[PDB]
């Protein structure tokens, strides 16, 4: 029993074709417009290559969508077209089929990027606050447009630290938000699935992304990725419990009349909440701040309802400095 | 009903510590000696980064071994030290722990390489003949050293085409061969598992690698990777049957007194063998040759006993040209 508390009826007000993506009809551009150069990533549903535009000579990313329901492609396609132009939104530049096989490939804008595992260490307390504030414009934008990115985590955010530029990518899991709809909890990536997906609360909302932003952030300031390290979905909730403590997992459950499969109940067990300061170690101490904690704390709640909105988070005392530097 | 037909004793004669790898005692070098630069890959059991040697200023590959039995590392390591120097064998340059996290890494020699998927097509009949003749020197060597690489497939062989240089890598599955030992069939990678692993014939030998070479090469000349595309272990055998034909799968089975779980029997079914020429398409015709076929055919046999030895294959009419070019 949930409904969004921000941007709920946007897809309601918009023309049906805006979110009725199966109704999309891909207007393929010209392949030979590009040439492939180096592979560079290989996801569950896609294969990523850096390619090039022979006309303008600009580097580009070619995502080659592996075998999947056409409707699951019209989705991302649409979602991407819908977001295009959005702040910090990866930008689809053209979409393509192939002569025979008949496999589709999405040709995105290029981002020079450094794997978080290599980059993040390198960032400074401010660096982080900035990037998150940037990552937030992405999420608030896209939510406001009726969409849930349902896959937020480091690997799906490209950072060109050279130009302090940021892009949120892979919208293969993003989906349109419709009030009261019962969605699928086999989303996000283990480590960053929020409680709701872990206790089967299917009518979830944008809030989901907030929890992933939660883990992602938490892990950045504490230097402990993944923060919650489940070996398995069940385990994930467990591992969450041992940090937010079960006395809250329960208040949550009752509020939404949700029932743990026994067993999961078991595995979870009784656990007290571990206060954020118990993760401030010596190396990480430079990034942990009363604010960083308040902010984190307001991202990671069992109750999606109680998490910060994107917008709300873009005003949190953590970002004051950054936000300054902005309109300057 | 198997024993190796070449190099069966390669460990019998050797001092026990040569193959008794749990007995190994890692002699850690200097982390500080290297710096990381970019992530480059990330395998089931590891994470690969390109790094650098601050002392000599040489590029290198840092493989950070994910969580696994210490004994499964002392294996890699030992095998690697045992091979070091071997022709076309990737080279382990130093192994490092880490004062804090106690976290082993293998720092290899660097290879500039192009993903097969983008590199292979690029190649010429000759080019292939060559790289397999190169890949062969690696397998014959290592087999001769009592070792089975157990997981041959494009992605584990680096090619610096700019230098016609080649390295066989990921000895994470390689294991010592001991006559009559019953090994584990959850090895190699789907597509490239040999029949023996698919029908549970546990006392396998170097032969296994031959079949992988088999698929690898088969797919390269025919331009059809993966050649045998199983969605699952059972399926794999099946897909193999529809090409080598069941009348052989049976002869094989009886020879080794092996019994198909019924059901697998089922799924396989009756199938006639498809002769190699029915894969010579227009686009691949320039690579296919009466020899390429004899050679492939002598790699891909249900019976590991009847496959070519590495050595044997390094004399096949296919390689005459290349083998010439070394003599000069």
């Amino acid at each position: 029993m949930s409904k969004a508390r921000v941007y709920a009826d946007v897809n309601v007000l918009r023309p049906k074709e805006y979110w009725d993506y199966e109704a999309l009809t891909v207007q393929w551009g010209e392949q030979d417009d590009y040439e492939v150069v180096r592979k560079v990533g290989r996801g569950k549903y896609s294969e990523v290559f850096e390619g090039i535009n022979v006309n303008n000579n600009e580097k580009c990313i070619i995502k080659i969508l592996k075998p999947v329901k056409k409707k699951k492609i019209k989705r991302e396609i649409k979602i991407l077209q819908n977001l295009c132009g959005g702040p910090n939104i990866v930008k689809l530049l053209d979409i393509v089929r192939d002569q025979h096989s008949k496999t589709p490939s999405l040709i995105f804008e290029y981002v020079n990027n450094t794997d978080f595992k290599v980059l993040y260490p390198t960032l400074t307390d401010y660096d982080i606050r900035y990037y998150i504030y940037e990552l937030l414009k992405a999420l608030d934008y896209c939510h406001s447009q009726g969409i849930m990115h349902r896959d937020v985590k480091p690997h799906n955010v490209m950072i060109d630290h050279e130009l302090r530029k940021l892009r949120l990518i892979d919208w293969g899991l993003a989906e349109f938000y419709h009030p009261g709809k019962e969605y699928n909890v086999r989303v996000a990536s283990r480590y960053f699935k929020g409680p709701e997906l872990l206790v089967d609360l299917q009518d979830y909302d944008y809030s989901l992304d907030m929890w992933s932003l939660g883990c992602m952030f938490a892990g950045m300031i504490f230097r402990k990725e993944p923060f919650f390290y489940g070996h398995d979905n069940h385990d994930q909730l467990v591992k969450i419990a041992k940090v937010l403590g079960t006395d809250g997992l329960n208040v949550y459950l009752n509020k939404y009349r949700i029932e743990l499969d026994p067993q999961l109940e078991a595995l979870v067990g009784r656990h007290s909440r571990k206060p954020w300061l118990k993760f401030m170690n010596a190396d990480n101490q430079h990034l942990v701040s009363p604010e960083a904690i308040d902010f984190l704390d307001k991202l990671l709640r069992y109750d999606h309802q109680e998490r910060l909105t994107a917008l709300e988070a873009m005003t949190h005392p953590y970002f004051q400095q950054v936000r300054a530097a902005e309109n300057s | 009903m198997s024993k190796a037909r070449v190099y069966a004793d390669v460990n019998v004669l050797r001092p026990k510590e040569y193959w008794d790898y749990e007995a190994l005692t890692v002699q850690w070098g200097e982390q500080d000696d290297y710096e990381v630069v970019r992530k480059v890959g990330r395998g089931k059991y590891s994470e690969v980064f390109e790094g650098i040697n601050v002392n000599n200023n040489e590029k290198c590959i840092i493989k950070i071994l994910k969580p696994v039995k210490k004994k499964k590392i002392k294996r890699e390591i030992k095998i690697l030290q045992n091979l070091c120097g071997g022709p076309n064998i990737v080279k382990l340059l130093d192994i490092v722990r880490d004062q804090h996290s106690k976290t082993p890494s293998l720092i290899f020699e660097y290879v500039n390489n192009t993903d097969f998927k983008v590199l292979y097509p690029t190649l010429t009949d000759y080019d292939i003949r060559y790289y397999i003749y190169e890949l062969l020197k690696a397998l014959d060597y290592c087999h001769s050293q009592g070792i089975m690489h157990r997981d041959v497939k494009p992605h584990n062989v680096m090619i610096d085409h700019e230098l016609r240089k080649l390295r066989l890598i990921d000895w994470g599955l390689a294991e010592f061969y001991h006559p009559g030992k019953e090994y584990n069939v959850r090895v190699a990678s789907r597509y490239f598992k040999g029949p023996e692993l698919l029908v549970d014939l546990q006392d396998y030998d170097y032969s296994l690698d031959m079949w992988s070479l088999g698929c690898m090469f088969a797919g390269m000349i025919f331009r059809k990777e993966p050649f045998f595309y199983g969605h699952d272990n059972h399926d794999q055998l099946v897909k193999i049957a529809k090409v080598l034909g069941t009348d052989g799968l049976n002869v094989y089975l009886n020879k080794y007194r092996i019994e198909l779980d019924p059901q697998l029997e089922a799924l396989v079914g009756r199938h006639s063998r498809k002769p190699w020429l029915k894969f010579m398409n227009a686009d691949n015709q320039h690579l296919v040759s009466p020899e390429a076929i004899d050679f492939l055919d002598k790699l891909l046999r249900y019976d590991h006993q009847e496959r070519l030895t590495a050595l044997e294959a390094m004399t096949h009419p296919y390689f005459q040209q290349v083998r010439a070019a070394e003599n000069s």
Binding site: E35, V36, V37, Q99, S101, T103 | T114, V118, T122
Partner: peptide
Amino acid sequence: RLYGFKIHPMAYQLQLQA
């Protein structure tokens, strides 16, 4: 149709590596 050199479906050129 001067065709040749294409993964999945795109033509591609060289081992431009690094």
